[PDB]
Amino acid sequence: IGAVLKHEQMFREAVNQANKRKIQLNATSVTHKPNAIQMALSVCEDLISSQVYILVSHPPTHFTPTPVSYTAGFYRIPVLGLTTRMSIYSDKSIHLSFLRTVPPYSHQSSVWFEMMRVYSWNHIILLVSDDHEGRAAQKRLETLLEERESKAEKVLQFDPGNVTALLMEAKELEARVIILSASEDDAATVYRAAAMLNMTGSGYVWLVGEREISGNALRYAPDGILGLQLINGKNESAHISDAVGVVAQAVHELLNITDPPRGCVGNTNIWKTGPLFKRVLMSSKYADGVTGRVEFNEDGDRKFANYSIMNLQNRKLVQVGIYNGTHVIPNDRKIIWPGGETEKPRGYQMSTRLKIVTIHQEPFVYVKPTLSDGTCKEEFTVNGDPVKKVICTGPNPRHTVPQCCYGFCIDLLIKLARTMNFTYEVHLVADGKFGTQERVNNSNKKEWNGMMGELLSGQADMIVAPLTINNERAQYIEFSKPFKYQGLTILVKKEIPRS
Amino acid sequence: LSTMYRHMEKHNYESAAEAIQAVRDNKLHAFIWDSAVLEFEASQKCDLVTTGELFFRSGFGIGMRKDSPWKQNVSLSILKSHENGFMEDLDKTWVRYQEC
Amino acid sequence: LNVALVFSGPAYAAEAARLGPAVAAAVDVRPVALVLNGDPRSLVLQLCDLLSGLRVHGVVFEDDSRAPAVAPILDFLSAQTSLPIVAVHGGAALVLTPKEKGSTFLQLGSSTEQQLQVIFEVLEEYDWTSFVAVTTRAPGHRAFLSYIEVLTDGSVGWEHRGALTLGEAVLSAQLRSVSAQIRLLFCAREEAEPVFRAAEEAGLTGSGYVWFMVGPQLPLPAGLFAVRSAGWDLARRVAAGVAVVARGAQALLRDYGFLPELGHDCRASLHRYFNITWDNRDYSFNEDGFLVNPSLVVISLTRDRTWEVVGSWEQQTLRLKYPLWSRYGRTQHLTVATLEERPFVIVEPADPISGTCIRDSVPCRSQPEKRCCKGFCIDILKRLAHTIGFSYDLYLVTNGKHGKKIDGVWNGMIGEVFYQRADMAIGSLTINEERSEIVDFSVPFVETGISVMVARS
Amino acid sequence: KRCCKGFCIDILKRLAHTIGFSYDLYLVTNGKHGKKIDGVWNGMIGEVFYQRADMAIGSLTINEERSEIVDFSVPFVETGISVMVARS
């Protein structure tokens, strides 16, 4: 056993301490290879040489501990990483023998959810890289937000390698607080893109992962943004100590011993001691460790870790709080904001402009063609009063010809717009159907057909029409108190008189 | 009514106006639709007739996206205007104003 | 340019390589090759030596032994070298995992999603319920349950899902705690055998129950069902693999016209070029490198303990053998026999858009094809079944209408009931003295008799 | 103990069956339906407002002040202001 990682002396003293705490704690370490193939060759060589019952640490530069994990899986022997963050290693489909002593960015997303819940920032925006780690973080954030009856307002996938279109898209919505998760270089690129626009001003609060914050501080670091880091940071030595301690604990717990393989130059066979010790370690709960109650998660992660919630203040990071494995310390000191605001601004932004969809229905929404100049005829009622018409497009594949709409629904909309300050543009639905929920062709999943697509898909923001209250519509969208009671009735032609 | 719907779906139209016109032209036997629109239609086009007991007594509504901040205010303003004379005034001048 | 052939077989690989060159030539003008040794140390050393010595375009590895081990390291070697590997004939290709940045593995196995899709296509034709879904807490169990939940929406019956920690008595009691005729299990072989033994000790291995094992693999229950791609020939598999490799290489040379390898012998992202057709089977590939729209078969267990093909899935279509099926349920099996009487029992053609009977109806088989029966008698029969509980089949009748003592022999529904062919008869049937004495009768509900109908008045 | 039955009781028990909870018919005496007497609510609205009663069912009309003070479910039986006269 031995971490690849002066570090040889650290391994020697760790082995001596573990032995002080039938043979116990034998150390067999090697050095990194420039070529991963050479690294795998060295790993198999010193696995054949000595009995390795495993440990490996991430070098500073992107490097990959994948070869040793793959070899361990090919031998089914337990393998425990030290300082690897990518969530791909979390999965056991290709790394069934792999465990890690440092939580990946998925728990960073979990802490993001915790902070958002603490600060009552109900609305949320995600700007996530299309990489695997970003996708896993986004999925964990969505499922952690699943139990609460709120979803992400709009998740934006940023392919690795300008995001100005996505930045504009995020700017034009109602939610203002966003959360970024991407590579350091992609983080710098999107930081420049946001800085060029006015989307980095007051009311635009956001917080990113550890490596994004580090890269931003390296290159740009938009001032006032929040950020998250591991409490211990790199902290190789204490992780080494806790790892060797838990390895000794597991070895003592095992001592059925089966057969720890050695000299497996061509021994194409698994060693049941490997899976047995892995299951024991999963059931194990190391206590009185350097980092605390070192418990291993079911997938092979760490439970109840510690994080530093820091803030960027002119290329200087100030630890605003401490996010435990359960909750976050409220406030160690004062927190700044990118716009200089001294408080936590509301994450939403009430839009003055509303997109209203409306269907043509006789006694409620009159629709007529516009005049020659595109205006509306200034007619009057029988009582000598004007009809407060409005101009809206939408009617006839055919192009969207503007037309004049007026009616009971239009009058109600006018009254509401006067009651609550609005600026509104109307447009009828292109489909021209009341929009139920229908099962799409060649798929099991269903979707909101018709005019309701204009509301669910964000095309509009308020459905004003002769809408009838029923079950699934109330399930997907929200309603208000009814303004006209009515039922379903039969219409039949009938001739009364008789000659 | 599932079997009745399976029968009805072979003749379902696409909009109200064409249905009303076809009912005028006797291309269809019976029409089923909302009470307010048909009441207004009978009050205008005194050729057809409305009948049957009301079968689904759920009122209309001004729909909006889920959990939008406007729900409380929109609902409260609609309720206040309905409670006030505004709703009745907007109703009388726009519907039920004709009786042939 | 050339194609390198590597096999982990200790003995059969020798004869396979001996017969290699003729088959490779028989199956572009690029040459072939064959090197085999049969161990991550040995694997890495041999493959690196072969690739250094021999300049090749794509490499095909064939082996069916110790599947869940070879695939990751082989994929890593391919990614490091950036060369097209193709695993064939089980083994490495059997394991399917999410890939890496530069990875190009071209696994020829079948994803668990496709397996579940095929199994559910076989279902909804045998049982409407995916009653028992049991998992062994395997690495793929989470995606397994997610896909089950994905495919269970819209349209199936469903009872429970559970996980077994594999004392065998505790897990057997937990397994039997869910009542379900049909159980589908997700497990590996080392967990499959103890689970089978525990189920046998729990009495669920009888012919009444059917197990649909879908875990990646391949004292024994009766009715095992699984799914595979094809095979059980190594030469044909090698021919298909080399044909796919040659087609991909020719497409690459047509697109740009350059040698495929990029050094990577001593250092100091192409799984998009697959539209492949061969052996009357689809061979296109997705981004992850697994077969898209494969030609799959479903296999079952025979009393001779041998695997026999039962049905074939291809072009998103199924074709099985003896398509008619019945829920034996072992009582609770009652063969309802009715006749046609328009006021009471209405038989209609099955709805062809959904290819099944519409709601508020019951399937009815004549005496092969299926119609939809509904009305008075059907509704009262289904209410009775709900309030009692049994499996009822609408076995219609043709020999007669209601019954006659023709040649002292009954016919119709009465004839069907009398000779035990039909368990019970419902529908339009009047009670008479001879009928009452020959066959018992329940309590009458709709009174009737002899009536006179006249003309307009 | 008395026995309560009718429209609201039946709809409440159907709702409880379709949701599942323990419901107690805590009747009221301080008021009838609610009034802003001395800026303080009473009746069923008063009981609900001060958390004494978890929820109120039965005869209760929806008004603007009631709607803003306390939330309301979807109306089911429409009603309003009506005029009743003598024999005719």
Ligand SMILES: *[C@@H]1O[C@H](CO)[C@@H](O[C@@H]2O[C@H](CO)[C@@H](O)[C@H](O)[C@H]2NC(C)=O)[C@H](O)[C@H]1NC(C)=O
């Ligand atoms: C226990 O530790 C000793 C000391 O490091 C190991 O001895 C060396 O092992 C390497 C690798 O097997 C050999 O290349 C050296 O020649 C060994 N030197 C000596 C002096 O023995 C030993 O292999 C370790 N044993 C186990 C089972 O890990």
Ligand SMILES: *[C@@H]1O[C@H](CO)[C@@H](O[C@@H]2O[C@H](CO)[C@@H](O)[C@H](O)[C@H]2NC(C)=O)[C@H](O)[C@H]1NC(C)=O
């Ligand atoms: C606007 O044009 C569309 C497109 O033709 C019309 O929708 C069609 O209506 C016919 C008549 O029922 C249907 O047969 C087609 O299937 C419809 N097509 C689509 C794409 O919906 C629509 O009715 C027109 N509306 C107006 C007001 O002219």
Ligand SMILES: *[C@@H]1O[C@H](CO)[C@@H](O[C@@H]2O[C@H](CO)[C@@H](O)[C@H](O)[C@H]2NC(C)=O)[C@H](O)[C@H]1NC(C)=O
């Ligand atoms: C809903 O209506 C309330 C009541 O008017 C609004 O609250 C007011 O908001 C303005 C602007 O923020 C303040 O100046 C007032 O002091 C607030 N009054 C009260 C009583 O809260 C609220 O903003 C409205 N919300 C929406 C989305 O329209």
Ligand SMILES: *[C@@H]1O[C@H](CO)[C@@H](O)[C@H](O)[C@H]1NC(C)=O
């Ligand atoms: C983003 O890049 C595209 C392509 O280079 C360019 O057309 C566009 O103007 C750029 N936008 C900004 C804001 O830089």
Ligand SMILES: *[C@@H]1O[C@H](CO)[C@@H](O)[C@H](O)[C@H]1NC(C)=O
């Ligand atoms: C709404 O508009 C009125 C009229 O201009 C104004 O007095 C009021 O302050 C406005 N309120 C808001 C919140 O914009």
Ligand SMILES: N[C@@H](CCC(=O)O)C(=O)O
């Ligand atoms: N219902 C009759 C058959 C037809 C008839 O005679 O009216 C019977 O059960 O015998």
Ligand SMILES: N[C@@H](CCC(=O)O)C(=O)O
């Ligand atoms: N139903 C009334 C009480 C009695 C009345 O005013 O008619 C309400 O809920 O306020």
